[PDB]
Amino acid sequence: GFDSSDLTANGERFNPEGITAAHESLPFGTLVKVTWAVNNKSVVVRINDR
């Protein structure tokens, strides 16, 4: 049900195709490198939602 009509806790329309993530305790705008152990590939996401 999370579409472009929902609003993130940041205050922007949720972009499902965006490189973003929701973190439970990090400040918005924090850049988090997420590394997947299966392929050892890392991507930096911007924390905007909660």
Partner 1 sequence: LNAPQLVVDDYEQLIIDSLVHTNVVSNGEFTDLDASGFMRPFAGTMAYAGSELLYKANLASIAAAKSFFKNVLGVPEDTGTKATTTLQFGLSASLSTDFIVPINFQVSDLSGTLRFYTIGNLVIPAGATFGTIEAIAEDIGEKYNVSANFIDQYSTPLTYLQYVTNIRPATNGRSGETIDNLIERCAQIIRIRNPVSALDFEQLAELTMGEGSRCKAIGLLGINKIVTDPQPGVVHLFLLDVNGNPADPVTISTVGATLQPRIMLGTRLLISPMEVLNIELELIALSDSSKTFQQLADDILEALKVFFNPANLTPGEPVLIEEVKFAIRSVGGLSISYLQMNDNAINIPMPNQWTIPRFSYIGFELTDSEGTVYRDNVVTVTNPEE
Partner 2 sequence: RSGRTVKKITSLQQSYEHWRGTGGYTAYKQLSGFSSPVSYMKGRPNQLVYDFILQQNGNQSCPVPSPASGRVVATGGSNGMVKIDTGGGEVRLLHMSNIRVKPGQNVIRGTILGTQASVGGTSTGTHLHIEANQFILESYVQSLVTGNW
Question: Contact positions toward partner 2, by CB under 8 A?
Answer: 12, 15, 17-20, 31, 33-35, 41-44, 46
CB of 14 to partner 1, least distance (A): 12
Q: Decide if 21 contacts 15 (C-beta within 8 A).
A: no
* Whole-number Å distance between alpha carbons of 46 and 37: 20
Beta strand pairing status for 41-49 and 20-22?
Answer: parallel
Site residues, partner 1 (CB under 8 A): 9-12, 27-29
**Residue 11 near which of partner 1, partner 2, none (CB within 5-8 Å, type-dependent):** partner 1
